[PDB]
Symmetry: D2
Subunit: 189 residues, 4 copies
């Protein structure tokens, strides 16, 4: 779980996986065998990002492969979030109502979004993001734009329309012209 | 895209990958080299599931590896579903309002669910399913049960609570006792 | 038979996921619910590739997702191969007998593993014949003789003379050719595609 | 330096995904937004493993997700190794010099690839010494001599006598031991962990 206990275990596995003893690995890093042994005893807590990049280099792998997963925040498979546990965040316009996330699925980023603008001309595109995205119009009408922001594709979405946006596809939302505001629920995954 | 064009191409790749010529592969299947060549020309459309299992066996792989992906139903990254394109389905109680799906992410199964019962004693558990699951209480109160149906864990979820259910975790929903009915939006992914 | 069983189980799983009962799927397919029940009861054996594609399509997924993995052909996690039992296959590129593939152990538990002793017959690097790269990553070892390897752009390749004991890695889709070193007659590779 | 750059880029990506600005993250971490901007400007080099874990935790993900892949050490998709350049390492299990590992080519583009010529020094199958299985799948080839292989439950193992040219596959975590065939002195394996 802790960075240094995950790292200690993974480091020993990797080192062994490539047949190095403490001495060999130590030679490659400007440390003693006793120091490398210490990292493997959970004493790597102070290693810098740069040093970690070097350890990962000499063992022909990534920092990823030497550090633990995000962890387990689940009560027997479940995490719950109560309505007023959420934070409210800005545009830069949208207002974000962040719903339940979990380290057992870091991709899951579900939001309730209030869409403050109803002037499709003001649509602020994002350059497309890392996961796929399910969306559902909660209240009102959404004017959606996607693809190339130069020559976009557009759609008018009444209340209760659902839509999917593939990863890295640039997109933008606004309420339908002169309808004031709409509400989206978004599930990035 | 079509089953037989995907299969034709994948079959040729696999056969070549394991160094077999048409003759060699044919010997293993009770066909002529000319017949195997035909499959590789898109003429495998009539092959049975059982025959496909055999082809996959002799090439030391799965039917999966020899057939195309689900396909692409996206208009430049996006698919949209209008409110009244959805089907309404039964319990066996819940009423399902199936939202937008896509072959580019077959796991995505988003639903609006009406929960018809408000007697937690009547909760019908499912044995847990294949994907992860995000849920959001749309209207009313949900009495949720999960884990072992013998000795379950339970939670009361007010309107606008969000929850995550890990894959294969058995779970059941009902409205809070004597509250009539509630609405969930579920996103299986 | 295990194919029909795995399909039966994965058909039921997928149908339940999209919230369709026997009737809904059966209608979307122009079948009776009994037939679909039958399929889900191990009776899908005779369905065609084309019918399977239809089923996968209606279910918004792939035939692959509805079919079981390649099975387990291991004996407590191990499969062995004795030198006598190797499939031997020819490698002809023009009309020229270029390689002889001696096929090493393979297993349905790691389908992409394709190891080989490759007899490298030609020894004139000038007539080296490129593949167009292939799907797997590849580990290679000079087993006997000396090898003249070419890779990358066939017009202007990178090159290496590799003696007995040399080892190389070729990343997927990277095009490559081998002959024995000019005038040495023949050489041998262990190639491990994974 | 490429570590700090990749972190900088992946930190910004992740922060934007969870909809936090510089201020929100900075506060959740007891830092100023300027420091977080600095991190996102390639200045994260000196952050500790522990600080990284905190950052990953607040961002509900893993350090791995915030750090770049192992780089590319290939020359147009190929890396070669000449027999002279092999790392040589000893394999001692009790006080006994059991194996000699000659390390073959490896690459950051397929970190799990670990090929070896293994010199098998012992030739008394009775004193065969098991590992506890390991992470990768493994392909093996009898390079020289004859091998006595044991696998599975060390109390009651499965076994194989394998002559020169035999090939085997060992699935991950399956425990296994090798010696040379009783009384033949020594043998050689090519082992390819992948
Ligand atoms: C993530 C929710 O769709 C909005 P964004 O992608 O515009 O932030
Ligand atoms: C999928 C939606 O959660 C409900 P179920 O899992 O009870 O069908
Ligand atoms: C496997 C040996 O490299 C050759 P090929 O990949 O062209 O067959
Ligand atoms: C790699 C050779 O099999 C032995 P080891 O895995 O025990 O080192
Ligand atoms: Zn988005
Ligand atoms: Zn569910
Ligand atoms: Zn090759
Ligand atoms: Zn091993």
């Amino acid at each position: 779980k802790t960075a240094s206990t995950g790292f200690a275990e993974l480091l020993k596995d990797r080192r062994e996986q490539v047949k190095m003893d403490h001495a060999a690995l130590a030679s490659l890093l400007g440390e003693t065998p006793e120091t490398v042994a210490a990292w493997e005893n959970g004493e790597g807590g102070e290693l810098t990002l740069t040093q970690l990049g070097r350890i990962a280099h000499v063992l022909g792998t990534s920092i990823g492969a030497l550090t633990p997963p995000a962890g387990n925040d689940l009560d027997d498979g479940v995490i719950i979030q109560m309505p007023d546990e959420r934070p409210i965040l800005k545009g830069v316009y949208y207002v974000y109502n962040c719903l339940v996330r979990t380290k057992r699925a870091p991709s899951l980023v579900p939001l309730v979004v209030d869409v403050l603008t109803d002037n499709p001309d003001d649509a602020k595109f994002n350059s497309g993001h890392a996961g796929n995205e399910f969306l559902f119009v909660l209240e009102g009408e959404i004017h959606m734009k996607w693809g190339d922001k130069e020559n976009p594709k557009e759609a008018l979405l009444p209340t209760g329309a659902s839509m999917f946006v593939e990863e890295h596809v640039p997109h933008a939302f606004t309420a339908a012209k002169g309808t004031g505001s709409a509400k989206l629920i978004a599930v990035n995954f």
